[PDB]
Design a protein around this ligand. Structure first.
Ligand SMILES: CN(C)c1cccc(CNC[C@@H](O)[C@H](Cc2ccccc2)NC(=O)[C@]2(Cc3ccccc3)CN(Cc3ccccc3)C(=O)N2)c1
Length: 379
């Protein structure tokens, strides 16, 4: 089994807070496009018309291999949204498996709050399941095609490395690269195949139990969403967390705006009080009954840095009313294996992740935890 995917390493790029994107080509002859990696969607879409924030776009009238499904679609994201027209064509990935598949594509015609000014990416690649792909579960997701058409194993992995400018990372399609991680890879079930829904069964700031019915952690749902930057937590759990964390940082106090993400804090050139902020652990239902493991992050993960002679940061842990959302603040610390074949997800320490001389992210296990499946939300 190949364990060194030389071609696919460092294949991802990103501009902090604006996401990680890969290079892809569509139409024939090929037209290059910087697509954005998003494990929290299922529509493959691209800028298909001129627009001020787009440096370039896909022109269906220049691809001989083009083809039009004669149907329109649009998708509402948390804040922005786009309206496109569906079709097909040949898609490739210059730094991915040397295959060339036919996928579905929404040519984006009209968009509001979707493209970001100078974000350098022109489209999105929803890597999630068909269950939530507009117009409906019929529009076969791109990764599903890449799979049925070629021989790339049904599974991909992601290494997102933040920074302390220009974030990088690896997207290994169809395999796991042994060099991207250290130690042991722990898996957690994928509750339901719509989003990448997992389950948290215990949370703790600086090793101290938050102590809530593990149902509040998954109130609505919990998902791994690379397409989201912040660690989003339910209403109740968010407050609990900020109080605890707040307690642990008390050496210095910060304006209510900070903990609400409205304001950003700074310190003299590289004199960040890293060691006052606590570590955060999420316990995820393990594979073996009554057995679970935990992933712990650092301030270097949840205090996303922001562009004088100071180092300013934005608190990256925020509230949510749509379940828990393990975004980038989480992921940027691990090597996450989205093993679709076996309905699961692995977590191992990320070999490129930012951490200081004294503390490092981690993944440890096992822990004999009882009544875990009850931590899940039923409706
Ligand atoms: C379609 N569907 C089933 C669905 C509907 C609603 C919610 C979700 C959950 N998935 C969300 C991600 O798929 C989606 C990916 C995206 C990125 C950039 C622009 C537009 C969309 N993220 C957000 O909407 C934002 C929503 C958001 C906007 C502003 C403040 C907080 C959150 C974008 N923002 C920052 C970001 C910008 C650029 C690149 C990467 C991340 C986030 O962290 N999340 C899925």
């Amino acid at each position: 089994k190949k364990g060194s995917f030389v071609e696919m390493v460092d294949n991802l790029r990103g501009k902090s807070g604006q996401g990680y994107y890969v290079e892809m080509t569509v139409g024939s002859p090929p037209q290059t496009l910087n697509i954005l990696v998003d494990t929290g969607s299922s529509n493959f879409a691209v800028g298909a018309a001129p627009h001020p924030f787009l440096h370039r776009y896909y022109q269906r009238q220049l691809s001989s291999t083009y083809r039009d499904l004669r149907k329109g679609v649009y998708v509402p994201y948390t804040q922005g949204k786009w309206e496109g027209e569906l079709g097909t064509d040949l898609v490739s990935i210059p730094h991915g498996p040397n295959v060339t598949v036919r996928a579905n594509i929404a040519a984006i015609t009209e968009s509001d709050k979707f493209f970001i000014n100078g974000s350098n990416w022109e489209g999105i690649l929803g890597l999630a399941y068909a269950e939530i792909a507009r117009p409906d579960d019929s529009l076969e997701p791109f990764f599903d095609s890449l799979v049925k058409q070629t021989h790339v194993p049904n599974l991909f992995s992601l290494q997102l490395c933040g920074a302390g400018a220009s974030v990088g990372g690896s997207m290994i399609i169809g395999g796991i690269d042994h060099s991207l991680y250290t130690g042991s890879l722990w898996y957690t079930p994928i509750r339901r195949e719509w989003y990448y829904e997992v389950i948290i069964v215990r949370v703790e700031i600086n090793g101290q139990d938050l102590k809530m019915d593990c149902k509040e952690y998954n109130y609505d749902k919990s998902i791994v969403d690379s397409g989201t930057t912040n660690l989003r937590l339910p209403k109740k759990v968010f407050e609990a967390a900020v109080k605890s964390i707040k307690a642990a940082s008390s050496t210095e106090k910060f304006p209510d705006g900070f903990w609400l993400g409205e304001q950003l804090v700074c310190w003299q050139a590289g004199t960040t009080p890293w060691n006052i902020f606590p570590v955060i652990s999420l316990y995820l239902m393990g594979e073996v009954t009554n057995q679970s493991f935990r992933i712990t992050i650092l301030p270097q993960q949840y205090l996303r840095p922001v562009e004088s002679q100071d180092d300013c940061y934005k608190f990256a842990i925020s509230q949510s009313s749509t379940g828990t959302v393990m975004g980038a603040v989480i992921m940027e610390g691990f090597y996450v294996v989205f093993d679709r074949a076996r309905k699961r997800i692995g977590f191992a320490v990320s070999a490129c992740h930012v951490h200081d001389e004294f503390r490092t992210a981690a993944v440890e296990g096992p822990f004999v935890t009882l009544d875990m499946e009850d931590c899940g939300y039923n409706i």
